[PDB]
């Protein structure tokens, strides 16, 4: 028996990609998908301190 | 007005006893053939609310 | 690291592949906080217990 | 080690999520240090 436990969620990420990626663009309507999540909008510059 | 609509929006967060309140997790975590359960219960609490 | 959930299949053909959390089909695609892996050895007649 | 007894205070306040929040009064449920102890 071998048993996964996966958890998902959570800010930061790892264990995964076995895709591709592609460039970035901004001001312009777009599917976007971020380490699985997905969506679509349009992305600027932040002002967000992190 | 405003209470009305808040409670309204804020509505969107609950999971009505599914596993996410986000339709594009669902459907990228799951075959479709076994979605349909999870995404009744977000499309009957919507609906009463 | 990169997950490559395709290899395991060219090792034998399996008693039980039941997931719970995601479809077995797409696990290529997602992204995950932290996985947990562990093994044992029992009888035949209690893996319906796991 | 001589023990002796004081208060507590408002001391013990951690971030308990790694999600950016702004100019809001969010309420959570976890494992904090009761006030004035």
Do not use: M, W
């Not at chain 2, 405003?2 to 459907?27: E, H, P, R």
């Not at chain 4, 951690?14 to 969010?26: G, M, N, Q, W």
């Amino acid at each position: 028996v071998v048993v996964l436990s996966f958890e998902l969620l959570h800010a930061p990420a790892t264990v995964c990609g076995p895709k591709k990626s592609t460039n970035l663009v901004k001001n312009k309507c777009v599917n976007f998908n971020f380490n699985g999540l997905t969506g679509t909008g349009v992305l600027t510059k932040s002002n967000k301190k992190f | 007005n405003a209470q009305a609509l808040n409670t309204l929006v804020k509505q969107l967060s609950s999971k009505f006893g599914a596993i996410s309140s986000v339709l594009n997790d669902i459907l990228s975590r799951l075959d479709p053939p076994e979605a349909e359960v999870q995404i009744d219960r977000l499309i009957t609490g919507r609906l009463q609310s | 690291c990169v997950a490559d959930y395709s290899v395991l299949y060219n090792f034998a053909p399996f008693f039980a592949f039941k997931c719970y959390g995601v479809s077995p089909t797409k696990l290529n695609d997602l992204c995950f906080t932290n996985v947990y892996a562990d093994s044992f050895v029992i009888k035949g007649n209690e893996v319906s217990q796991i | 080690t001589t023990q002796s007894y004081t208060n507590s205070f408002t001391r013990g306040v951690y971030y308990p999520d790694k999600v950016f929040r702004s100019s809001v009064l969010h309420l959570t449920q976890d494992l904090f240090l009761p006030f004035f102890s």
